[PDB]
Assembly symmetry: D2
Homo-oligomer: 242 residues x 4
Amino acid sequence: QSMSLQGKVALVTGASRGIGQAIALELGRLGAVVIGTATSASGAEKIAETLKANGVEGAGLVLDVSSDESVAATLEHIQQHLGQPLIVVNNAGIRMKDDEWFDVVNTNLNSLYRLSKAVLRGMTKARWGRIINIGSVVGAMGNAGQTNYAAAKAGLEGFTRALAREVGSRAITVNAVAPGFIDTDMTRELPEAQREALLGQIPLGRLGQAEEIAKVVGFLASDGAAYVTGATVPVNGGMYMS
Amino acid sequence: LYFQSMSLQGKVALVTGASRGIGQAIALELGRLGAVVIGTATSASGAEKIAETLKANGVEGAGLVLDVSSDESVAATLEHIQQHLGQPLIVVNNAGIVRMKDDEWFDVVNTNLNSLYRLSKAVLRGMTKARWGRIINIGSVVGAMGNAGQTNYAAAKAGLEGFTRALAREVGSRAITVNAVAPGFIDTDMTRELPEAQREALLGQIPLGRLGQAEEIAKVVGFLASDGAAYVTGATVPVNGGMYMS
Amino acid sequence: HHHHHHSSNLYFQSMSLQGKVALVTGASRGIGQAIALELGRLGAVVIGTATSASGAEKIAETLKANGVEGAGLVLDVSSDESVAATLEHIQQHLGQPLIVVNNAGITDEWFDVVNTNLNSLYRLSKAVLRGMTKARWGRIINIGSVVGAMGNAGQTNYAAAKAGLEGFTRALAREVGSRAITVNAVAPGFIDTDMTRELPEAQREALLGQIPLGRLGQAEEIAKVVGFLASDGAAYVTGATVPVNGGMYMS
Amino acid sequence: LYFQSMSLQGKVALVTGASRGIGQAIALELGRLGAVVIGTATSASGAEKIAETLKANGVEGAGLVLDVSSDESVAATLEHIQQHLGQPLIVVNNAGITRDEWFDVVNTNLNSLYRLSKAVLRGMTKARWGRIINIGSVVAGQTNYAAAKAGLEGFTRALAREVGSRAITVNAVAPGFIDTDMTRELPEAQREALLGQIPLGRLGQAEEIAKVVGFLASDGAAYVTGATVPVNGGMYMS
């Protein structure tokens, strides 16, 4: 179809669970060869098993997006065995305290930059690419959680717009998806009172599914989305936390 | 039952302002995805052009005359559809109303949002019954080069964003999503007639280095109409090649 | 009779508006009253408005008590007739308003409140523009209350309404800027009123937990921002929506 | 009604990047409002210029060398201030760091803001009062400007939320095109095009940024926190 990613290699960080897993499976459904990453060898192997179980061609790999050496080594590995990743989804991130938002957002954006700069060479050669950055999920307890959510989203939006402007003349798009309260391993077991309070602020009246984030990412990765760049797509059931 | 990503089989879609450009591209995309498409124009000749265009492309549906400024026209149009085709559960609003000046924004935005409210309120009854719907509001493209053009484009985009977010919040509990698509510079009649120097300057403000196609807007709409976009509501998706003006 | 116009060598340092005439709509209470008094502190001749004669008289009494020159007048910003007639009356008796603060509002509600209220901002703002154009100076300041872009009007409508107010304010600023008229908006958060004070303790506590400053804002704290925007020092600020919300930003 | 504090007597203000333009105007405005003003520059000659400018204008304070990119410079300078002048309770960050460059510029600059802000926040926490005001960079140009503004807004809002219970406000000012350095050399055709994008039809004055900062620093602005005030004559870039 026109949604096809056949012939494309995709790299999805943080793919062993939750949103990242769902992204990897959706890109695979669309025909990409998917490389999914975890911070451990056991995670990488699990990804491979998940991809097999779903008929997706690709691999699991160990990647630490905080490390220049890890990034360079991993990308060389991929280039030698699978091909140049032309679709890259930055999903891996590194109580919440009222004073740690800065180091979290700072670190995460430094990792987005690190990985993006590493993969842009291959996209620049191909004169095509998709870079999709995934924001953090709502749910963390406290005013500190709200603080961090909004701070991370603001970093994400700015970074994505800036990079999009930098690389657009190469037919590379750069977009973000900002999830709301999504059913993941991290939110499923939040205290009931908190889950109930969050649901009360969501017009749709339900958590989002990981797959509902992944469908958006799959669209953005498609040829149909070629004129969408610099955007942050909120996927939040109408709940806009700021 | 049937269950396939992207399919709009069994759904009836109403696309206002479907006789040319973006609206036509939307009607044909929805049709490609399997919807029965009713496209509308303010004139009989437009409606006929819609009907012919749908036929030529193997899309089931009809071209109808609708004036979104009129309560009577809206009620009559929805009755006609309900009797002959079924309840429209996908509604795409693209029917918006000597050099352009920077005092024209208010009339144009105000009129367009008041007509948008009218249409939306009318189609919500059916969607509420069905406990499912998609309302997709299409923004106005940049209509002139220079300041007035920017003033008027930003005002319309702001209005559209706020209206979309408010309506989404109102109707979300019914599993109806309400989203907007905000075009940038799209290849259309205005841009087709620009001088080279002006085109070149314009393309320099666009990171992708090119105008958008109507079909690039239509693809985003098609996605938003799908089951996969069920958790996207109250959003304005910009489709502008990286050219952000507010 | 119901009468509809009620009138109100010590040089305070605060006075910088030199007897400029300011029109503050919805000045009977709360934020509008505070704005009227603030502009008086800054040396304007202050016309505060209400929709009833009793409100106009209350405003006049408040201005008198505080030593501010001006008047309380009846104005209905929803009415073309009222706006035209009232502006003419002001021009004849007091002078041309060069500072206009839109604080009167109304409160399908999700659409009609914002729609009605932006139509009213446009009506009054267009009316006063002739005078400001002649003077080649003006200040138009929109209070977010009028569309419900005020925390006290509640979370449900807030962010969508503020997006309307912001876009409208920025467009009008673009339209009238060549005339040295600025157009700005103030978006208040939760402000201390009888209504928020009569909240139960648990509910007040929950509310304060959403506010980093840990307290409701005072009406005077909104008025001081408006006063600044009306000043010469704010001449390069235009098209801005200034949130005044203690760090509680609803989206 | 007519009496209160909208002035800054008895307060100490630190204005980083005070030797020229916007920073100098900020320093003078805070001085006019009655603050004791410490202005900083990256060089001894800059510090001397500050000190001379303050003196010429009857403002008490000092000109000091500060490198906001350096942990050592920030700690040494703040210690020096605390011992000789007092605790700065109004801090205006206008010092920029020079550095495909938008990422490093925004990243370096927010790392600097965070550094300086953490350093000064102890004193404000003791006083149970403070004002932090972050100045954005004035107007590829669009890309860099908007990125620096986006970083700035989110950073400011987050720090505001962290410190608000202490009665410390944190706000930003986002200037548009201001009559300083760069614009003083633009070709006429470019100036004319630029002015056409500005509804007021003129560049801003440094003093017009400084008056906004002066207001934010006042008691009257006590409920404004987390805000980025655009001061751009109606020229908005996103």
